[PDB]
Symmetry: C11
Subunit: 69 residues, 11 copies
Amino acid sequence: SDFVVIKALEDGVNVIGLTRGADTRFHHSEKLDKGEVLIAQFTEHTSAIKVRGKAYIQTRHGVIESEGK
Amino acid sequence: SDFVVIKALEDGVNVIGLTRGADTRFHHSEKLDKGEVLIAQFTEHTSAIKVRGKAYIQTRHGVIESEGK
Amino acid sequence: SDFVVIKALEDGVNVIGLTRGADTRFHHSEKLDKGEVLIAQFTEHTSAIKVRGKAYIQTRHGVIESEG
Amino acid sequence: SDFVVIKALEDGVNVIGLTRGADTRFHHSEKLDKGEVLIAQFTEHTSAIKVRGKAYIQTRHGVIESEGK
Amino acid sequence: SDFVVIKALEDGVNVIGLTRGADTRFHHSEKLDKGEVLIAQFTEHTSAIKVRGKAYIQTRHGVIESEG
Amino acid sequence: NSDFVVIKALEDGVNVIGLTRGADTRFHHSEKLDKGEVLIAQFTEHTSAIKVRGKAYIQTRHGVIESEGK
Amino acid sequence: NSDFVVIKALEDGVNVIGLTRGADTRFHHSEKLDKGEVLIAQFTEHTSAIKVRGKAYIQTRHGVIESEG
Amino acid sequence: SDFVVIKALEDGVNVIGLTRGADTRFHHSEKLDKGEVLIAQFTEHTSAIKVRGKAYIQTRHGVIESEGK
Amino acid sequence: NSDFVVIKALEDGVNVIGLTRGADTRFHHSEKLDKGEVLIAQFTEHTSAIKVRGKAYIQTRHGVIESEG
Amino acid sequence: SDFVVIKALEDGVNVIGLTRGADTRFHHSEKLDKGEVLIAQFTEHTSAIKVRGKAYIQTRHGVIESEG
Amino acid sequence: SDFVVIKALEDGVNVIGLTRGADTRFHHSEKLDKGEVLIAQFTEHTSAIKVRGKAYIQTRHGVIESEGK
Ligand SMILES: N[C@@H](Cc1c[nH]c2ccccc12)C(=O)O
Ligand SMILES: N[C@@H](Cc1c[nH]c2ccccc12)C(=O)O
Ligand SMILES: N[C@@H](Cc1c[nH]c2ccccc12)C(=O)O
Ligand SMILES: N[C@@H](Cc1c[nH]c2ccccc12)C(=O)O
Ligand SMILES: N[C@@H](Cc1c[nH]c2ccccc12)C(=O)O
Ligand SMILES: N[C@@H](Cc1c[nH]c2ccccc12)C(=O)O
Ligand SMILES: N[C@@H](Cc1c[nH]c2ccccc12)C(=O)O
Ligand SMILES: N[C@@H](Cc1c[nH]c2ccccc12)C(=O)O
Ligand SMILES: N[C@@H](Cc1c[nH]c2ccccc12)C(=O)O
Ligand SMILES: N[C@@H](Cc1c[nH]c2ccccc12)C(=O)O
Ligand SMILES: N[C@@H](Cc1c[nH]c2ccccc12)C(=O)O
Ligand SMILES: N[C@@H](Cc1c[nH]c2ccccc12)C(=O)O
């Protein structure tokens, strides 16, 4: 299973997991403060991940940055 | 299982999931506001994804950009 | 499973799914307007995909363009 | 499963599927008009694909071009 | 399964499939006229393929040309 | 089997935190690292996300990233 | 499923010979190739070694090799 | 199944195995002296490895060096 | 779907010798090749080691090696 | 299964196998003399290998040298 | 399953197979004379291979030479 690396570039960045299955909703929100790193998998319960705030992102396809505000 | 990365380049980008199976319709529309990133898999319920609006997309195959009206 | 990427370079592009199995026919036609992107897999029900209209297409084998 | 991309370079190109199994015959002819693209897999029912007419073909082994009469 | 691509460089090219199993013979010959392309798999029934005639051949090992 | 991450602690008191796999998300273990220790940690049946706090040098299949403390 | 060998006959009468898989080893088939003909042949339940006699150009996973008459 | 190489740059290096499962504890500590190498797998019982002391370390992602107290 | 070895005989009377898989080790089959013939031989249920006597050009997954008379 | 190459650069190099499982123990020590090569796998019984003495070592991750 | 290529650079080279399992001992010693090539797999019975004497060795990891007494 693939994972995504997320480095928070400011306080209060949110890594949100959406539910796998016929229903789509947020099941969890992980708050990252500046400089913190989260390495997060796709799992049985999480089939999509949303990032809100300024962060540097690595995936198998390369780097992308989310932008706050 | 494969996933796409979607960075909204403007407000109100829509990431639309089409059902796996004999029938084809939309089962969920994730809206993204400017700067937000979504990392989204193909799953048991989603076998085709559609993007409406200005966004920067990465897939196994490289980058593509969606353009809004 | 493999997928194709389709960006509509014009209004009214169709992505057509043909049926998997001993019979071959159209079961669904996804309309795309200019600028819209569809990412679409091969599936239990779709074993061939047809693009009609002006689109930029990426597959595992590279880029190919359909023309109006 | 592998697949092949076929761009029709002229009207009336045919992508023919030959049946898998002990017997070999044509089971379906998809007609393409100039500019239309087909992406078609090898399947339980098709284990060989014939292209008739001028078209641009990509497969895992590269680009090949069919020509008409 | 792997597959072979055959472009007919003249009329009357032959793509011949040999039977898989303890015994060996031709089970189907597919005629290819000049310019026609066949993409053919190895399968439950075909474990070798012979090409007779002038053709352009691609496999996973590269290109090879048959001569008439 | 599954992927792993390399974490070198660039100061004392670095925290490598495992998040629970499954429908609920909580911290189950926090492995503390002092300066210069290396931890090589996998994703597992119990761990489906890892969070790093403090200044550390990180390697994954996607390349290096560095965490920074406050 | 299963490596294959490409054999181009560089003269008439080239022989591609299959050896039997199993505890016992013998020739079970000899496929005659005349000048310019190409044979693409798999390893199989029945054939676990292939011998080429006569002048031919051979491609395998490992490269080209040439047999001499 | 993945493995790490550990070369001890000083006496007393410490390769610590952590238990796989819902509980996390060290279950084995293999000490290395200067110049000794260990090649260790991830296993049914070890899902994380900790290195203490000055060592040179190769994993699939590259070399990393641990530095001691 | 195992590895195979390409052997080209550079002189008459080269010998490709197959050793038995199992607790017991000895030769079960000796294929003689004369100058210029090529043998392409797999590892199999019955052969888990191959020995080449004489002058031949050998290709494997790991590159070319030459056996000498 | 992965394996490792050990060429002893001096007499008396030891390649030690640690047991797979909940318990960790040396179960075999192969002595290598100057210039002898061992190619050894991870197995059902051996899930860690320790090299003691001067040797040149190749693994999937590259070359590393143990020193006496 | 992996294999090793061993070319004898002198007479009396020894390719020695160690037993797979809880016990470790020699079960077969295959002698090579100068110029002979042995291509030998890992197997249900052999999980470690030792070479004595001057040989050129190729594995997945490269070329290593054994030096004889
Ligand atoms: N309990 C969650 C933890 C998690 C993994 N990846 C995530 C991404 C976003 C949010 C939560 C998560 C799960 O197993 O799915
Ligand atoms: N519950 C949906 C969530 C989802 C995943 N990928 C998506 C892409 C588009 C829209 C929704 C989704 C699913 O499991 O499939
Ligand atoms: N419901 C369709 C959706 C789909 C996936 N790929 C397609 C390609 C073309 C048309 C429709 C589709 C299916 O699972 O097959
Ligand atoms: N129903 C057919 C459709 C098809 C797939 N690939 C093809 C190639 C050529 C012609 C038809 C097809 C099938 O599953 O096989
Ligand atoms: N019915 C044949 C079709 C075929 C596939 N590949 C071929 C190559 C040559 C001749 C026929 C074929 C089969 O499944 O095997
Ligand atoms: N050996 C039989 C049956 C057979 C085995 N494999 C085949 C592939 C194709 C056609 C027939 C066969 C025959 O030649 O008739
Ligand atoms: N009936 C033979 C056909 C064949 C395949 N590969 C070959 C190589 C040489 C000679 C014959 C063959 C088989 O399935 O094995
Ligand atoms: N017992 C834990 C060990 C572990 C693995 N990865 C981790 C990451 C962080 C913290 C602990 C761990 C587990 O199997 O999951
Ligand atoms: N019947 C033998 C044929 C063979 C394959 N590879 C070989 C190498 C050497 C000698 C004989 C063989 C087998 O299946 O094993
Ligand atoms: N008995 C331990 C041996 C081991 C493998 N890798 C390790 C890493 C650290 C400590 C011990 C080990 C096991 O199978 O897990
Ligand atoms: N009988 C041992 C032999 C062995 C394999 N790899 C080793 C590494 C070191 C020492 C012994 C071994 C085993 O199968 O595990
Ligand atoms: N019968 C032995 C032959 C063998 C294979 N690899 C070897 C390496 C060394 C010595 C003998 C062998 C076996 O299956 O294991």
